[PDB]
């Protein structure tokens, strides 16, 4: 049919580079793009690394910058592999690191550092060592005040009981999350709950609250209970079709 | 036979395209007619006959000057001329039909023109324009199947068909266009001196036996042309 | 290319545009081959905004 697909695109480029004429093709890509910067390199397929190596490995006057975090390699289901990332990590001599966290309050950074320092080799891979990170000076003032009382950066809601089933766990946690989000919204509508950078503040709108879920049925279980309280919500990963309504 | 030739929009366009690229100063070529019938897809049986028919068109005489289409050189002819005529004030059917009926009997025979007000431009394609003896003419091809017999292509029947398909207004507008173009181009132009009339050529009506059958000749009144020009101008 | 023609005789017939609108201001800036934007290199130039041209609030040309 003369058609083509994503996996077919990658496989065809790889085959071309591996073939006899691919050498010429390599120059065609190398002269075109002297420097290439790959981001989110932890999610990498063996094909992609073979291509990048074939093109930019040892030729002069051509740089290559790999930027990635192995602790975030979560696309294994999609064909990505962490082992090829570690292979690349072994094949590269130079390594560079960023020390400070610029994203979140110093509370969240300390919370994460404490939770991942419990055991040794937490990620159970010898090539993935965990180290504590330090927050930046800009965020030292960040706080979240709820009903006049500063809330802890991280709060774990423990369910009650000895043995809890999967369905009971899902229903109870969905209900609890719905109730807590409703309380946050009610307290922010009156100007009490504020996200504060030093003296500046702003109420907690229904937009800044995000619920991270793993599966579709999980998201629907969240959304149903959240709409039971007449709270507007939307699921960004919704792939349903309009015609099914 | 030409009368029994297939008719329609595409047959008519093919018949016109034949003359569009036909050289009048040379005899018809059989291979060319065969190729055109191959393009149109018609039967090759027409190829011997149609060629002859084409010559019957080229050699047929015209208005009393006696002009043959073969006598027209490439310098004295203009085929498929496109014209643009502006109409400034709105053109009312009643305010025009009255004048056309006043100066033309064909309009007087027919019911009044009916169309909505129009202001803007007017487009049109004149089939042929040619000059003979320093006198210009207008030639319009028509392939409408008036009748099955040659009597349906006589003077009275041709005038009846003109009145039925309202070709009167058509040739009147064509004459206004030609008049304005000649006045624009020809230095020291005069209507009566330089204009020669209008010639409707019915292809199927063309017969070597009868000179009158197939051709129709009519000259619009100069007063009608002047009043129509003034009406369309303001 | 047009300037490089040897046997060419050219006359210029332009029409000046009066800057009565924002759109006419832009067209006049283009026609007169002059630059109106202020970069603000000087601190005195950067402080005051009078160097720019007044824009009428009701104006809706662009």
């Amino acid at each position: 049919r003369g058609e083509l697909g994503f996996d077919d695109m990658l496989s065809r480029l790889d085959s071309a580079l591996r073939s006899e004429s691919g050498e010429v093709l390599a120059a065609a890509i190398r002269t075109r793009f002297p420097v290439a910067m790959i981001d989110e390199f932890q999610d990498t397929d063996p094909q992609q690394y073979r291509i990048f190596r074939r093109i930019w490995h040892h030729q002069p006057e051509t740089a290559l910058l790999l930027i990635g975090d192995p602790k975030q390699a979560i696309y294994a289901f999609r064909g990505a592999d962490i082992f090829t990332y570690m292979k690349a990590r072994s094949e590269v001599h130079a390594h560079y690191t960023l020390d400070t966290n610029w994203r979140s309050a110093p509370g969240m950074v300390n919370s994460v550092n404490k939770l991942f320092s419990q055991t040794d080799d937490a990620f159970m891979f010898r090539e993935i060592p965990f180290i504590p990170v330090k927050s930046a000076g800009k965020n030292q003032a960040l706080r979240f005040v709820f009903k006049g009382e500063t809330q802890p950066a991280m709060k774990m809601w423990l369910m009650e009981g000895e043995s809890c089933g999967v369905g009971d766990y899902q229903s109870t946690m969905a209900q609890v999350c719905a109730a807590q989000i409703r309380d946050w919204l009610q307290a922010g509508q009156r100007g009490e709950a504020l996200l504060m950078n030093g003296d500046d503040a702003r109420p907690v709108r229904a937009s800044d609250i995000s619920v991270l879920v793993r599966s579709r049925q999980e998201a629907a279980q969240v959304r149903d209970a959240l709409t039971l309280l007449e709270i507007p919500s939307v699921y960004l990963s919704n792939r349903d079709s309009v015609f099914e309504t | 036979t030409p009368h029994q030739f297939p008719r329609g929009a595409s047959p008519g366009t093919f018949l016109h395209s034949l003359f569009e690229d036909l050289d009048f100063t040379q005899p018809v070529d059989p291979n060319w007619v065969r190729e055109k019938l191959e393009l149109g897809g018609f039967e090759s049986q027409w190829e011997p006959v149609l060629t002859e028919w084409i010559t019957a068109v080229l050699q047929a005489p015209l208005n009393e000057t006696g002009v043959s289409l073969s006598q027209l050189s490439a310098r004295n002819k203009q085929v498929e001329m496109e014209f643009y005529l502006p109409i400034s004030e709105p053109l009312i059917a009643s305010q025009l039909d009255t004048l056309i009926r006043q100066f033309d009997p064909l309009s007087a025979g027919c019911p009044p023109l009916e169309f909505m007000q129009v202001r803007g431009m007017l487009k049109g394609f004149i089939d042929l324009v040619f000059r003979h003896e320093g006198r210009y003419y207008l030639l319009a091809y028509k392939s409408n199947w008036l009748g099955e017999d040659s009597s349906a292509y006589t003077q009275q029947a041709m005038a009846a068909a003109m009145q039925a398909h309202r070709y009167d207004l058509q040739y009147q507008l064509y004459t206004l266009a030609l008049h304005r173009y000649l006045r624009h181009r020809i230095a020291d132009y005069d209507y009566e001196h330089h204009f020669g009339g209008v010639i409707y050529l019915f292809l199927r009506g063309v017969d070597k036996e009868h000179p009158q059958q197939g051709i129709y000749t009519t000259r619009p009144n100069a007063g009608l042309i002047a009043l129509m020009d003034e009406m369309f101008a303001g | 290319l047009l300037s490089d023609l040897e046997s060419s005789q050219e006359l210029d017939a332009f029409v000046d545009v009066t800057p009565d609108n924002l759109l006419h201001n832009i067209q006049s800036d283009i026609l007169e081959l002059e630059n109106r934007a202020v970069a603000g290199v000087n601190i005195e130039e950067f402080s005051r905004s009078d160097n720019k041209r007044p824009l009428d609030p009701l104006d809706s040309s662009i």
Partner: protein, 63 residues
């Protein structure tokens, strides 16, 4: 009986169009296919003529 008459045609042509042919042999194919499969009408005649014209132009350049 009508449907079975269509498929029969659909059979014949699907055997005729398989083999490769020189350009001059491709000339009558379009016309035969049009007149066999289609019964023209006032509106469709324009499209059919355009089809024949483009096909003839392609094969004419080729020849």
């Amino acid at each position: 009986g009508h449907l079975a008459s269509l498929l029969m045609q659909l059979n014949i042509w699907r055997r005729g169009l398989a083999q490769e042919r020189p350009l001059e042999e491709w000339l009558p194919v379009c016309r035969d296919m049009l007149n066999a499969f289609f019964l023209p009408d006032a509106e469709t005649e324009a499209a059919m003529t355009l089809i024949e014209q483009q096909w003839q132009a392609i094969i004419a350049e080729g020849l």
